[PDB]
Amino acid sequence: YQLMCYYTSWAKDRPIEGSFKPGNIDPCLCTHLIYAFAGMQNNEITYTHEQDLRDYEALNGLKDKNTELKTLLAIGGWKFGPAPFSAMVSTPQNRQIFIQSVIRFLRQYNFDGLNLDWQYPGSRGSPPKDKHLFSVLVKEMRKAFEEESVEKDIPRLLLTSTGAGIIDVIKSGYKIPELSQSLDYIQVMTYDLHDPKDGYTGENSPLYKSPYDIGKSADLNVDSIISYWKDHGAASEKLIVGFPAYGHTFILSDPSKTGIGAPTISTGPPGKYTDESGLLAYYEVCTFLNEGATEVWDAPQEVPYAYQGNEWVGYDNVRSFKLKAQWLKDNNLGGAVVWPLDMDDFSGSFCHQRHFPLTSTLKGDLNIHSASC
């Protein structure tokens, strides 16, 4: 199995004891490290800030400590949106400029591959033709990587893509059989499934549906999402399941209604370190529990939640990661991706479960081994 781990460029800018740098990464923890994110300018991949080049050096320098470790550079994400990708795939010239820039950039900075993270082809303003054009881009990029490998007599660069977790988004953006042919891996975004607009508490990444879920809400779970990708032609071995190292928060309408599906008012207030309304890092959830929140296990969804007063959080813990890792192995999947590694308890100071409790759980349960480790 694979165990991929995201490192986000902005984690180092958090308050110091919650800040994370590539040097704080245990080189033997993961099989792949993904740097989020590269930028784009003039249809070419590029760095977003001057400091990113020092980050690339520190991250890729970890390969001297684990010679089997692979690194990937991600481009895109939710905040970047669809418009730069729609323009880049629109013409063969623009796609060639991009692909050539990627080969030069990854080789210069010692990355092992690219992770495409277009959110999303075919939605958010991206027209229906982008579902076809994204598939064309991926095929052309895989061909160019194969050609470079043969010409230079060096291992081929890896090509991965994220894959939506929302069924309607998958339908409008992904030619699944063709994408599965050309990609090395599809990183399925089995998280942010809390449906904040619904007006009820929901889990960020439940393994199974709640008995309270109806209609499309019954598909907002790991099992249904991965089943959809496999039923529509994705290779099981290429599917990498998203494992979030955070939860989502809500304000309850009634402090006496605290379960899953309880009425809500809004997202919860930002955490001291992550500073994002509606989100808490796993290490921040540990503070919430340490300071008195009531912890509950929901067996139908196989995930925890916690509450205090009118504050409620749905998240993932060691138990839910262990049950999901067993499910992953039982279903012959390719592995897992931790999103983001910098929200796991990297220091061990918040949760008292040693360094990286969530990711270390997957390392052991997925039998991750490297001969250099």
Numbering used by the authors: 1 to 373
The authors write:
Although mice do not encode Gal10 in their genome, they do form pseudo-CLCs, made from the chitinase-like proteins Ym1 and/or Ym2, encoded by Chil3 and Chil4 and made by myeloid and epithelial cells respectively. Ym1 and Ym2 are among the most strongly induced proteins in the airways of mice after allergen exposure and both proteins readily form pseudo-CLCs in vivo.
Crystallographic studies using microfocus synchrotron X-rays showed that the crystals obtained from the BAL fluid of mev/mev mice were Ym1 crystals, in accordance with a previous report. Native in vivo isolated Ym1 crystals and recombinant Ym1 crystals as well as native in vivo isolated Ym2 crystals and recombinant Ym2 crystals were crystallographically equivalent, sharing the same monoclinic space group (P21) and unit-cell parameters. Moreover, X-ray crystallographic studies showed that a native in vivo isolated Ym1 crystal and a native in vivo isolated Ym2 crystal are structurally similar to each other, which is not so surprisingly as Ym1 (Chil3) and Ym2 (Chil4) are two closely related proteins sharing 95% nucleotide sequence identity and 91% amino acid sequence identity. (C–E) Structural superposition of the X-ray structures determined from a native in vivo grown Ym1 crystal isolated from the BAL fluid of mev/mev mice (C+E) (yellow), a native in vivo grown Ym2 crystal isolated from the BAL fluid of a C57BL/6J-Tg(CAG-Gal10)Bla mouse (D+E) (blue) and a recombinant Ym1 (C) and Ym2 (D) crystal (grey). The low root-mean-square deviations (RMSDs) establish structural similarity.
